[PDB]
């Protein structure tokens with residue numbers, strides 16, 4: 001019943017979002033791009049080649065890809081344009097993506113619950129939950 | 137008539153190879169994996185989201201992906217398992233991928249000639265040319 005990293009592999013579509021505006025505010029995202037991101041309703045394509053993890057976020061506005069090895073720190077350029085130092089780990093059934101930039105930090109965790117991918121984003125007191133389902 | 141980075145985008149299949157064994161020897165690849173790599177005849181899928189470049193090498197034996205921003209150094213784990221510091225640049229119609237590890241260096245350049253992707257690999261006195269064509 002506990003997920004593995006491979007369970008996250010696939011093409012996922014955003015079905016539900018809560019607290020995303022508030023989270024993007026904490027990250028520093030301005031109004032215009034916030035509204036653009038809120039209307040964007042993307043896919044998230046995840047591939048897991050062993051512990052080589054690739055996460056592709058695809059929308060009609062912008063597409064982002066990072067590809068990493070689990071537990072090895074890497075430089076990420078985020079969709080909002082932050083340059084972070086990021087490490088992905090796998091903890092209690094969740095992919096945990098920790099970003100640090102300018103002495104700030106945020107965590108994005110992705111986990112399978114009840115066949116859906118639950119993506120929880122935290123920065124300071126701001127939390128966002130996004131629900132994805134698998135494209136058939 | 138001179139190529140741009142976007143011309144490299146697509147799904148490419150290996151059609152011709154010369155000097156690949158000799159190049160893999162210079163890299164340190166042992167006999168077994170050399171023969172495995174020589175029979176592998178992969179695809180190379182390249183995406184170019186502005187200057188965010190993703191190169192996915194796909195085979196039935198192993199699949200590798202790196203995703204980088206042009207001109208920003210990054211840590212690559214190569215298909216043969218080297219941990220390098222790599223920088224991709226765009227020079228005279230070619231994507232140039234420079235790898236350094238342990239005071240060693242190698243360059244892989246990818247360019248469109250006559251509608252095919254020519255991939256030239258150099259390390260020391262060892263050179264390899266691989267020819268890819270676009271999958272329809």
Ligand SMILES: CCCCCCCCCCCCCCCCCCCC(=O)OC(CO)CO
Pocket residue numbers: 024029033034036037040042044055056057059061062078079080108110119121130
């Ligand atoms: C949502 C962004 C799409 C592109 C928006 C258009 C322009 C750029 C503005 C981006 C707004 C800031 C995004 C940074 C937050 C990333 C985490 C999002 C979590 C998520 O569902 O994504 C997925 C994969 O990241 C988790 O599975």
Ligand SMILES: CCCCCCCCCCCCCCCCCCCC(=O)OC(CO)CO
Pocket residue numbers: 160165169170172173176178180191192193195197198214215216244246255257266
């Ligand atoms: C060829 C390797 C496929 C996997 C082989 C199976 C197991 C791992 C052994 C790999 C042998 C060493 C490969 C390192 C050399 C990479 C450059 C290859 C150039 C090429 O055509 O690739 C493409 C994309 O890299 C250029 O477009």
Ligand SMILES: [Cl-]
Pocket residue numbers: 065066075076077078203204205
């Ligand atoms: Cl990036």
Ligand SMILES: [Cl-]
Pocket residue numbers: 067068069201202211212213214
């Ligand atoms: Cl890598």
